[PDB]
Amino acid sequence: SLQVTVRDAINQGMDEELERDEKVFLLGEEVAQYDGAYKVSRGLWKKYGDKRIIDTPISEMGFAGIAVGAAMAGLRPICEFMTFNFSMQAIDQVINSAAKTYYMSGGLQPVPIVFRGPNGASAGVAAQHSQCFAAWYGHCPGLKVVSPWNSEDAKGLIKSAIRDNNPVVVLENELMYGVPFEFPPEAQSKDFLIPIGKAKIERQGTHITVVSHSRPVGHCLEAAAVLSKEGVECEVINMRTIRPMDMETIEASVMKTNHLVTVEGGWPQFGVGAEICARIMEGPAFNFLDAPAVRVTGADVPMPYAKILEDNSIPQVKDIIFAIKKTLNI
Amino acid sequence: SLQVTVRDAINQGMDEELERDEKVFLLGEEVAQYDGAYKVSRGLWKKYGDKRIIDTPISEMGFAGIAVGAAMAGLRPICEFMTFNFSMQAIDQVINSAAKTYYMSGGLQPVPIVFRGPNGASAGVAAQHSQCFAAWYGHCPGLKVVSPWNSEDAKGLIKSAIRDNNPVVVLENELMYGVPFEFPPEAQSKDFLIPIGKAKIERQGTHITVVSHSRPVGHCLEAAAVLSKEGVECEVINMRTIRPMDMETIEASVMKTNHLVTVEGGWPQFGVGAEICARIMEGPAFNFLDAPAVRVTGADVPMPYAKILEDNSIPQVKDIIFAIKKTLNI
Amino acid sequence: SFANDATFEIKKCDLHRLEEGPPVTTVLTREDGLKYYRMMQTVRRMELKADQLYKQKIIRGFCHLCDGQEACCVGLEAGINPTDHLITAYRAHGFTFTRGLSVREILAELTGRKGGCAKGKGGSMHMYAKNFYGGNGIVGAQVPLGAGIALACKYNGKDEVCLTLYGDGAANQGQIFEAYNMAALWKLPCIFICENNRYGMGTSVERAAASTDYYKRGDFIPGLRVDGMDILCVREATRFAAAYCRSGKGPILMELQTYRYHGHSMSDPGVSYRTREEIQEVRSKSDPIMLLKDRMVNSNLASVEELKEIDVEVRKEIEDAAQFATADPEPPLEELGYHIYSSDPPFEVRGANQWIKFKSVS
């Protein structure tokens, strides 16, 4: 029907979940009176007040800890990190207080919390503000990690994350906030959910399977558009979930296309692509490969400031096409 | 003759480096008057005093930050985390203050620091004290990460880490501290060094390549002894370094053996094994695999307390033997 | 015949930013006295048994005993409601008991059997109960959690409060000061409690903190220092602090000055940083059970025979629990992957290799 931006989509989601359950609340720096550092929480404090939307001091470990505590006490908080770079101060609270508790308690203590905020590369923000944390958080038993791309992903995933009685890390994306997408009536519904753990095929194809998550999904779709004109048809997969990832979907696709290329924004070593490739080798789809699976990632360096350098530290459309052509040997 | 335990090897190493450079010093909880939480720093405070060997209060982020600051100012500190589980509080200082600084400064500011302490699984310490951080720290550009196994590894790496003008993470192992090894005359020398980035073949073999790091290396050697009685000859590789890992050695090995199995203690998803497998597929050795490379890791759960459960959350010799037999199809 | 109650003098509390503190006089009833005695003795006997079980290797890993600080956990419980909330660190065997759980499940958890309160998944440090948000193994981590539990109390408007305990060693954790600031800023019904047993593992308070006045560390938050060896003193300080938070004035710090008889954990003799003369002198002059015992006998609240009677039943209870803990079966291996996620349909989890799969049920 209408064009809705990822920012407005996330907002709509949190708004609908806040109205549905009085136990849900949002806290973090500038989430309330500032209307959000990236305007994601715009209008919420106005609508819900001091109790539901809480501005906090710059105390990551503290307000993340407070959030986990409220969750243990029966509340369902949404803890925002202005960027996930800042989550490193509170990462002990995410892993040791939240992720492991249900297991350590023997099933007596659930922790229905959600950690959300922009993750990964932005534009000219340099090394301490560009880091992607998908591989880090995807490593940990007891967490669920998601990484939306378009508006549908954003709204659906944020709502599933909230209704889920476990710690869910929602890795969003700053550059995606402003991008609009055709919002079908099904996504406009307050009852729109996207199941955590199910991948999505954004484009049918027969020649090669291209798997990705978050922003570079859009780049994979550009690469497929160019390659389509040269006779090559790519099957593009949007992961949506980092943990527990949907390997079955990828496997079924690779059985068909016989080729595989993973695309992520984060660092290469021990990254999202590494796991996918390992899973392909250990899985029933390994015999269906006619060529080794290869990885397209960000450069193995801290993020440089300068434009020409930053452009080459992030996966570009040409980099995805080049890798696809080496794999298909054309 | 002359048995030296991994614990005493480390002690020996720091002792020699402390005497060599007055700018080197040790800080952390219980490192001085308590003789070390695991007796690694025994006798050091007696020998060097309040200035060089410093007990700190329980303030990880704080004293790691202080350590980095001292490093930036020209000192060469050794920052001990009682276990690496506790490093999570200070991980922002490790990644953002230390690892990335030299790059961001454009080569004007080096950070000669070393973060050491026992990492990974122990015995019955449960979920918040058993976590392996090899993949987390190996993920990050600007760090060097090492993971010793025996006494030679420990001493050589710890001296190389200290003499290195960069942040080096030394992931030790609690269960390895008490284990004695034949300490050859070359390791007793004050100039005994182990180059960061070079793997070691603990056992020559022709049938399969078994790669590992830290404690399970010893378990790989046990497995190889058993398999040798059945005609299977395993080439066991001790990684030593996690970043930059020595893929060249592994590749050459797999080129001969035609088979590969990785063994790690940490969690499987996005773990050390994932990268080794992703690299083998992308590299020139993939054509030489006669069977898919498979991973032996710890169970995908927070560490349970109960003995029978903890035993099954850690790779045992029988699990390594089982995986090897699957790859060789015997 | 016995007196229905008696009146006792308790030590005055040092104050920080408070006009008045708790009374220096308090009334103890016969019924309450007998109860507090039984509770304190049980925690004591329980810890002594755990030490013995650890040396027989039936308990492994971590095991932090709280004997010597019995006046605290029984005292705090005596000054709060069952509906109030409490969280502490790893030295939580006593609190687990005072908050409702039996010595059976506490010991069976320590011995890692299916009959433990955490099904043998937790061990010494991780035990949970109704409005007891457990022991926590990361030093300091429970303080923000506590301010968080307190936040829920205010959020639900049921007039409940939260006790949030930490040790003297923990007091220098950054998150605790972040917790102070927000708890004060939002007027949370949080009672920050610092158990001061003089030592942080092996580091004495003098070597760990520039300031050893823990009830003042709060700065803008008002505090008070209590004698943690006197059950009645702790009780009175607790009722005062609870009333204060319930009245809506926000958080408050409470320092309990106590002492631990054992060395931090089982892997620490605890004789290298303190003398045995110090330990024995504290035990002979300020033992919390002995102090109460003398009070009740000398004021005709109970007889020597009645207390000797209670001792026998408690010994029996601890012995029956230890036999349960020794003989109870270990958890079934098939349940290794259980309880990873809440409210999820079952799925499979990877073991040591890709061919080992465990069923995971919520």
Place this chain on the structure above:
Amino acid sequence: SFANDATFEIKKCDLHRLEEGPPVTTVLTREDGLKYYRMMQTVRRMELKADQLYKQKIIRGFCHLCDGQEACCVGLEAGINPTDHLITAYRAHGFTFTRGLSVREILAELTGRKGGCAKGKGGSMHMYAKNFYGGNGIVGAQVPLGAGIALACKYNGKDEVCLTLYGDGAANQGQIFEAYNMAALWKLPCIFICENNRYGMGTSVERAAASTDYYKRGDFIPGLRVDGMDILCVREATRFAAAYCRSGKGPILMELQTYRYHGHSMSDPGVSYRTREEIQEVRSKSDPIMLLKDRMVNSNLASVEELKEIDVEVRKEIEDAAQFATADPEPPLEELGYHIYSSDPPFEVRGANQWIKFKSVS
């Protein structure tokens, strides 16, 4: 003809755990006055030019301006030695200049060209100089670092001190309180400085801190509050604090009460959390350059014409530097991987795909 020097009354500092503070009179020489005026004006014009360059898209990403706080960076530099150490956060364009770097190198870094102080690898937030351990983007992180630098100072026994600056928003970071404790416990020559610009991004001090007396947050550490709009107050307070640390009395807190004319960053107009009248009231009543100008003119230390002349020279220099920064070429792509490790043999690093390799040289 002019007077060679004059004597001025400066505001008394509020004290915390100090019997006496810095003096309330100070001597300013003509030559020192002129230098301070030129420096402050230079920082001012540089920031206004950066604002202009950002709106033309020549500067991107983050860009935090410090105009209004010129008395701070210039004041602090005036009360310390070049051999002393200083560290701060991301709002460090002034400090970068006062500590030695040229407006050319600062602007060229902001525009991300090879002629920058970090060859365009850093941008606004990350610039380093001689005894200037940079701006740091992680709020609070620089405070432990500063105490670490203080530790090295004592360790080397060279009688140097370290200034460690953080904002009012940062003041609630836990690591800062961990740093207080250690800096006090080891008697480190650390001057904790809190620049209070009333706002932490968009959050005023009243909504972020339960106690807005930042010079008292140290508790056991003594502190003092300075007027951060008065170059001479800051200078005198700094000389006092540095003297205090050099004598070996340990750490000390210093709250500078200042103000920023721009919003938090270039991505923040700064009108939703404060009025335009409030900004104008500070600029017409307390502008640090205006205050100095008035003092020097009214005491016959300099003339109105002489100072306007300095204004002209400074604006032209800034104009010339901006043309260089805009016209200077970007870093060569071949050097993307440089400077990952220090003192290492060259090696190659992976780019966007496995076939892209970048050379890495120390």
